[PDB]
Amino acid sequence: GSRIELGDVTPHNIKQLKRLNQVIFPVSYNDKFYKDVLEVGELAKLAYFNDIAVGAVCCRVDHSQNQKRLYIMTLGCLAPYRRLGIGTKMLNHVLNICEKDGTFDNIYLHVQISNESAIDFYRKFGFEIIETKKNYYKRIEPADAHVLQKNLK
């Protein structure tokens, strides 16, 4: 069958999503982040390894540049669960969502320029580096971030 499944984010499992993000990413988000993601439904899932929360993906919709883009705010799982196909599962999930309506031009995200393993993961699914924004992070080094975009339309 399957021992890696995805599941919803509800107000009952929100602190678990938040804990995960604290461990996985070197930036901290305040609770605006976690309030907004309660409203996007399918654009935010938790990843389970047998009812243990191991990672999550959280998205947001940007209407700008006359484009409707999907923005991946966070996608990740705890270190010992990497290279298991969990991130692919979550990415494929956001991709599966973008192509159930067809109203999307692109999907994009930010990746720190030192994070070579995230760069390799996204470029594998057809995200290209379109822009390198300098001093995008405030509190961490290196501060520069690539803009990885995948095209749909």
Partner: peptide, 4 residues
């Protein structure tokens, strides 16, 4: 990974 989003800003800051």
């Amino acid at each position: 990974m989003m800003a800051s």
